[PDB]
């Protein structure tokens, strides 16, 4: 299925993944 905002922010719970958006 498509990604969605719930699943996306779940993925960003990982600090390294969140860090991709704040280098």
């Amino acid at each position: 299925m498509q990604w969605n905002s719930t699943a996306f922010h779940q993925a960003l719970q990982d600090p390294r993944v969140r860090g991709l958006y704040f280098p």
Partner: antibody
Amino acid sequence: QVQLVQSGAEVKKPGSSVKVSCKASGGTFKTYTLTWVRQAPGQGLEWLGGIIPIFDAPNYAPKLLGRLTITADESTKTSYMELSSLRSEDSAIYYCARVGDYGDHPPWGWFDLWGQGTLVTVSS
Amino acid sequence: EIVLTQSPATLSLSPGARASLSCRASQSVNNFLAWYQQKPGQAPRLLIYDASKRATGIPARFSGSGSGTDFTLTISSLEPEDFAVYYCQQRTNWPPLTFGGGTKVEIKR
């Protein structure tokens, strides 16, 4: 000072496909830079899709999933919106828009710069 | 999907009057709401973003307020160039990102 220039009007039969382009005149450009929105005659704005940064993942309006493809050529600073299996209700002005900074809330910023629009008419 | 509902559909106001436009979300969007202006034959233009921040180039008579589900765009004193259609939009819940249905501000004479 960046400007967004879209391709010209299109006229299509039902069941066919259309590919509209949007070229940025300069500035930093990634595949995620440009999102697509449309507006049917006399109606409001409908988001078509965009590209999630980093993952470079296109994300589309559920009602068009399977029919809509958004791509971008970073070497030419051009985004492309391709919509297939066209229906009369796809008749609309199609706009490209630049997504601005998302602040602390990825993946989407706001639509801070717009193309001039491309008219697409679908009719027998 | 988060549905944005705008009210009223049309405002009829004289130049110089205050305009108050409503946008309500079916569930909370925190502050992740923006307002755009659109005139006939033109693309939309961003006015206010994240509920209350004013985009560069936008006059000081435009202000946004609200949080959660209930938002307001206020034009403190209408100029002739302000008669137009206004849309709200949210950037937090997707797919799809959603827009309100628009409010047209037209000239009362």
